[PDB]
Scaffold this motif. Structure first.
Motif, mmCIF file in Angstrom:
data_model
loop_
_atom_site.group_PDB
_atom_site.id
_atom_site.type_symbol
_atom_site.label_atom_id
_atom_site.label_comp_id
_atom_site.label_asym_id
_atom_site.label_seq_id
_atom_site.Cartn_x
_atom_site.Cartn_y
_atom_site.Cartn_z
ATOM 1 N N UNK A 117 -4.089 -33.571 11.057
ATOM 2 C CA UNK A 117 -4.062 -32.185 10.604
ATOM 3 C C UNK A 117 -5.077 -31.338 11.362
ATOM 4 N N UNK A 168 3.541 -25.428 -3.091
ATOM 5 C CA UNK A 168 2.463 -25.298 -4.067
ATOM 6 C C UNK A 168 2.908 -25.778 -5.443
ATOM 7 N N UNK A 202 17.364 -21.413 -6.681
ATOM 8 C CA UNK A 202 17.254 -20.483 -7.803
ATOM 9 C C UNK A 202 16.358 -19.306 -7.436
ATOM 10 N N UNK A 252 12.824 -25.971 -17.353
ATOM 11 C CA UNK A 252 13.582 -27.090 -16.807
ATOM 12 C C UNK A 252 12.774 -27.913 -15.812
ATOM 13 N N UNK A 306 16.123 -27.657 -5.349
ATOM 14 C CA UNK A 306 16.792 -27.319 -6.603
ATOM 15 C C UNK A 306 16.186 -26.066 -7.224
ATOM 16 N N UNK A 309 3.379 -29.691 -5.467
ATOM 17 C CA UNK A 309 2.147 -30.469 -5.446
ATOM 18 C C UNK A 309 1.209 -30.144 -6.602
ATOM 19 N N UNK A 328 12.823 -19.936 -15.950
ATOM 20 C CA UNK A 328 13.389 -21.135 -15.348
ATOM 21 C C UNK A 328 12.380 -22.267 -15.210
ATOM 22 N N UNK A 365 -4.371 -38.890 8.389
ATOM 23 C CA UNK A 365 -3.781 -37.604 8.036
ATOM 24 C C UNK A 365 -4.755 -36.462 8.296
ATOM 25 N N UNK A 385 0.283 -34.463 -12.296
ATOM 26 C CA UNK A 385 -0.959 -34.474 -13.077
ATOM 27 C C UNK A 385 -1.004 -33.196 -13.905
ATOM 28 N N UNK A 396 15.722 -33.410 -2.872
ATOM 29 C CA UNK A 396 16.576 -32.666 -3.793
ATOM 30 C C UNK A 396 15.752 -31.696 -4.631
ATOM 31 N N UNK A 424 18.233 -17.008 -5.186
ATOM 32 C CA UNK A 424 19.216 -16.244 -5.947
ATOM 33 C C UNK A 424 18.555 -15.150 -6.775
ATOM 34 N N UNK A 425 17.310 -15.363 -7.206
ATOM 35 C CA UNK A 425 16.590 -14.346 -7.963
ATOM 36 C C UNK A 425 15.968 -13.273 -7.079
#
Ligand SMILES: *[C@@H]1O[C@H](CO)[C@@H](O)[C@H](O)[C@H]1NC(C)=O
Lengths: 36, 48, 115, 238, 40
Positions: free
Chosen positions: D235, D35, D20, D49, D16, D38, D46, D231, D42, D12, D23-24
């Motif tokens: 990779x 980016x 936005x 929020x 989210x 992650x 807009x 991993x 630590x 989600x 839309x911008x």
């Protein structure tokens, strides 16, 4: 799972739902202010 | 109860989880115990 | 730091083996110490994103382990003696020496008391 | 259900802000979202929020670490039903079990496991105290004797290295008592007195007189290192 | 120097020896905060 975790899980959804509408109305408000 | 029924002749052998007390032993003979247990306190679970 | 001194070398080995792998990855698409500088900076983008994620995970694991060890050691060590109810008094070895002054009320109390 | 909760929450929150940003647009592709996600852990109007959500997540992870630290502050054979007792020769070190002769538990063992005498005879002793020194010197592995004696030995042991198996496992209880000869009429006089003493608390107060006794991170690190290596190699291959 | 010192807390080859000191100070302050929390 825990009470704090459940509270955070319930709160984040409401927060993002409110924030989406806040951004949508703030974009229109900023556009109207810039137009004036 | 059970001791009265046994004394009245309605029963002869008692096979039930019956404890051992001095008063009961003064009138009713008890065989070897099954398991060694005591009395504990029961409290309903409390949610955190 | 006597908190499992044999395991402290593992952290150093872990933070050292990542540098050579990072340098090899950079060479396979910044020679001697740039990789070490970047690793220490992020400890303080496909493959690079995964490296950053695993570095963040390493830092989180290290800090969580340190906090847990400190919390455990604060209560497990360096927090007793109860008295007669302590069973070690009834069976005293040579490690603990119990003594008093002769011809006193303590001797009379010990003689009179049973067990 | 924290794992599934975070798995469905990351999906989600990975859109989210993408919605936005899209839309911008009328900024680049999903790389920016990755980016930001992650780097959020630590250390454009807009971003408030998402900064508040980052602070809340930091508080949540600090609380989780504190809870784990507070929780972190608080094996052998299960009994006689193990195949090792039946076949002690399976392992290279033979099992060293024995007991004093002319006892009472030997006949009980014979009535149940008559084949154990071949091993009992090779580890017989001449005293209960010899078992302790044999175990200390490695001459024996375990001692088979009455539970009451073992509890006293564990309670008076130096360093508390000796302890009964499990949480005091008891088999074939048959607790002993005061014996009396056949035909003695004193049984009815002594059993009532003993029962009264037991029920009135004489046993409880006299118990303290004599019955005195004293009563992983590496795996996680290894698993995390293995996962990180897997991993990295996948990779590199991809 | 003043700005670097005041930004060193919380979040040229000579910066390694001050970065390691910053990390050590972070560990020290984390231990102090844990001890203060446990003292209550
Ligand atoms: C056990 O009884 C036998 C009887 O023949 C005797 O020879 C042996 O010495 C006894 N052992 C102990 C420890 O009493």
């Amino acid at each position: 799972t825990f009470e704090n975790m459940a509270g955070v899980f319930m709160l984040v959804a409401g927060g993002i739902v409110a924030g989406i509408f806040l951004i949508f109305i703030e974009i229109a408000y900023k556009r109207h202010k810039d137009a004036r | 109860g059970m001791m009265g029924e046994l004394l009245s002749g309605q029963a002869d052998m008692i096979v039930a989880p019956l404890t051992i007390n001095n008063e009961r032993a003064q009138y009713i003979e008890f065989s070897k115990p099954f398991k060694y247990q005591g009395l504990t306190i029961l409290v309903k679970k409390e949610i955190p | 730091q006597p908190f499992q001194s044999t395991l402290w070398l593992l952290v150093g080995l872990s933070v050292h083996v990542v540098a050579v792998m990072l340098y090899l990855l950079d060479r396979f698409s910044l020679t001697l110490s740039s990789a070490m500088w970047f690793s220490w900076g992020v400890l303080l983008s496909f493959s690079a994103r995964i490296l950053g994620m695993v570095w963040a995970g390493f830092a989180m694991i290290i800090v969580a382990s340190y906090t847990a060890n400190l919390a455990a050691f604060l209560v497990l060590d360096r927090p007793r003696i109860t008295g007669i109810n302590d069973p070690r008094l009834r069976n005293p070895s040579d490690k603990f020496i119990y003594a008093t002054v002769k011809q006193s009320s303590v001797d009379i109390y010990f003689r009179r008391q049973v067990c | 259900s924290v794992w599934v909760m975070m798995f469905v929450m990351l999906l989600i929150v990975s859109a989210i802000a993408v919605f936005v940003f899209e839309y911008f647009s009328p900024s680049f592709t999903i790389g920016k979202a990755i980016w930001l996600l992650w780097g959020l852990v630590f250390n454009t109007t807009s971003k408030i929020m998402v900064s508040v959500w980052a602070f809340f997540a930091v508080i949540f992870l600090a609380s989780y670490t504190a809870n784990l630290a507070a929780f972190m502050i608080q094996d052998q054979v299960t009994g006689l039903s193990d195949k090792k007792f039946q076949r002690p020769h399976d392992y290279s070190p033979p099992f060293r079990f024995g007991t004093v002769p002319n006892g009472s538990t030997e006949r009980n063992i014979r009535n149940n496991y008559p084949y154990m005498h071949q091993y009992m005879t090779k580890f017989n002793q001449k005293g209960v105290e010899d078992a302790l020194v044999s175990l200390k010197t490695g001459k024996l592995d375990a001692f088979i004797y009455d539970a009451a004696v073992l509890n006293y030995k564990a309670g008076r042991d130096e360093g508390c290295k000796l302890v009964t198996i499990g949480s005091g496992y008891i088999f074939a209880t048959t607790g002993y008592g005061i014996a009396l000869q056949k035909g003695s009429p004193w049984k009815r006089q002594i059993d009532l007195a003993l029962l009264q003493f037991v029920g009135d608390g004489e046993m409880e107060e006299l118990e303290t007189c004599w019955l005195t006794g004293i009563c992983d991170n590496m795996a996680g690190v290894f698993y995390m290192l293995a996962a990180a290596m897997a991993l990295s190699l996948i990779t590199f291959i991809w």
